[PDB]
Amino acid sequence: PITGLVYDQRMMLHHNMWDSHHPELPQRISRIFSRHEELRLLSRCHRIPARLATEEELALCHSSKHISIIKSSEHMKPRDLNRLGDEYNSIFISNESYTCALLAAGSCFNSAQAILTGQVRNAVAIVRPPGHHAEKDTACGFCFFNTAALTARYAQSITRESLRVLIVDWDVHHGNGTQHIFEEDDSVLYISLHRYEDGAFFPNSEDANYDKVGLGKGRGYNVNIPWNGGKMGDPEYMAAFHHLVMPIAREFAPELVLVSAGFDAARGDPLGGFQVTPEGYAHLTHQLMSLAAGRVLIILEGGYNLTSISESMSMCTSMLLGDSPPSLHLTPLKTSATVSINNVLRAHAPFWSSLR
Numbered sequence: 001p002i003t004g005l006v007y008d009q010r011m012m013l014h015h016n017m018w019d020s021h022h023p024e025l026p027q028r029i030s031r032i033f034s035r036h037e038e039l040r041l042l043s044r045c046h047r048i049p050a051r052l053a054t055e056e057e058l059a060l061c062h063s064s065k066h067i068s069i070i071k072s073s074e075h076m077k078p079r080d081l082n083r084l085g086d087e088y089n090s091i092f093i094s095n096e097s098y099t100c101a102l103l104a105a106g107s108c109f110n111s112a113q114a115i116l117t118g119q120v121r122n123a124v125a126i127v128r129p130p131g132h133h134a135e136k137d138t139a140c141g142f143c144f145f146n147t148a149a150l151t152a153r154y155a156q157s158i159t160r161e162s163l164r165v166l167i168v169d170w171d172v173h174h175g176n177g178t179q180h181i182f183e184e185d186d187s188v189l190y191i192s193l194h195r196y197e198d199g200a201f202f203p204n205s206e207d208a209n210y211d212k213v214g215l216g217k218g219r220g221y222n223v224n225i226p227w228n229g230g231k232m233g234d235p236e237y238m239a240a241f242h243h244l245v246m247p248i249a250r251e252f253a254p255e256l257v258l259v260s261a262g263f264d265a266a267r268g269d270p271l272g273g274f275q276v277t278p279e280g281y282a283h284l285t286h287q288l289m290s291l292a293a294g295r296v297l298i299i300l301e302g303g304y305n306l307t308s309i310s311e312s313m314s315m316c317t318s319m320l321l322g323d324s325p326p327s328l329h330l331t332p333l334k335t336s337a338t339v340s341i342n343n344v345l346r347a348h349a350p351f352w353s354s355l356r
């Protein structure tokens with residue numbers, strides 16, 4: 001009955017040399033780590049070491065070409081770092097980026113290993129750069145390699161290929177990369193909640209809509225919960241978990257839960273424009289703990305308000321550690337959120353008896 005925590009300050013080295021105020025800041029992870037220490041959560045966790053992912057582990061989800069191109073950035077001069085970064089949608093690269101991306105992934109592999117060998121029950125990974133926009137063949141949206149997707153494959157690689165992995169992506173952005181990597185796969189259930197605005201919200205693709213339910217044997221194993229019509233918060237997230245995320249997850253019966261835990265749906269986030277509270281994140285976490293005999297790994301994705309992300313992720317770790325959830329879903333839903341939830345219910349009732 002132990003919670004693992006992984007954090008390595010070396011992941012701060014990845015930086016934007018042209019815009020030191022770019023929101024994907026080095027201090028995102030050091031601020032979260034500090035708050036864990038302040039709240040005396042850190043001393044209650046078992047510290048899991050970071051490590052580098054290997055290139056063979058990266059190839060679980062990524063092309064050899066993509067891996068080698070990002071690796072080639074290690075010795076580039078600034079002009080070529082700028083040129084390479086510009087080939088992608090919303091990427092900056094420094095000489096340390098590749099190393100940091102390897103540490104973020106390797107850290108999560110060690111955490112998944114710790115859970116699956118029984119060394120810990122659950123774990124939190126305070127890592128950057130993030131992962132869920134990264135595609136098999138390309139970088140995107142501050143992400144180089146798809147850490148959560150890789151971790152799902154890594155977990156299968158030390159157990160069995162068909163190990164049932166649930167990935168819950170509550171970053172305010174759609175994890176386009178994660179959806180695509182698993183779109184034809186019934187062994188990995190992908191559930192994302194995300195601001196959509198009929199395609200106006202990053203990453204601006206209809207792939208994020210509720211009617212994208214998976215392909216082939218993966219049909220039904222991709223669940224998009226898209227928000228339209230501005231600010232959402234605890235009531236809408238709690239309702240989506242109540243009507244969709246938890247009934248589907250229970251029916252799937254995952255053997256491991258990975259959370260693509262961005263905290264940019266948080267109150268105060270400059271990119272997300274939503275108002276999920278730290279208490280709200282605590283309740284989301286506590287619900288997921290009822291799955292997979294408690295085998296939950298929380299992986300940092302986005303989240304850009306340093307105070308908001310520090311408080312929110314610390315609350316998640318407090319839940320993992322077995323603390324009582326804080327008092328909380330204070331309001332009727334925005335009408336467009338009701339419409340969203342009902343659209344997803346209609347889209348997935350053919351696949352999940354729990355929705356009928």
Ligand SMILES: [K+]
Nearest residue numbers: 169171173193
């Ligand atoms: K998401």
Ligand SMILES: [K+]
Nearest residue numbers: 182185188221
């Ligand atoms: K899937």
Ligand SMILES: [Zn+2]
Nearest residue numbers: 171172173302
């Ligand atoms: Zn995000």
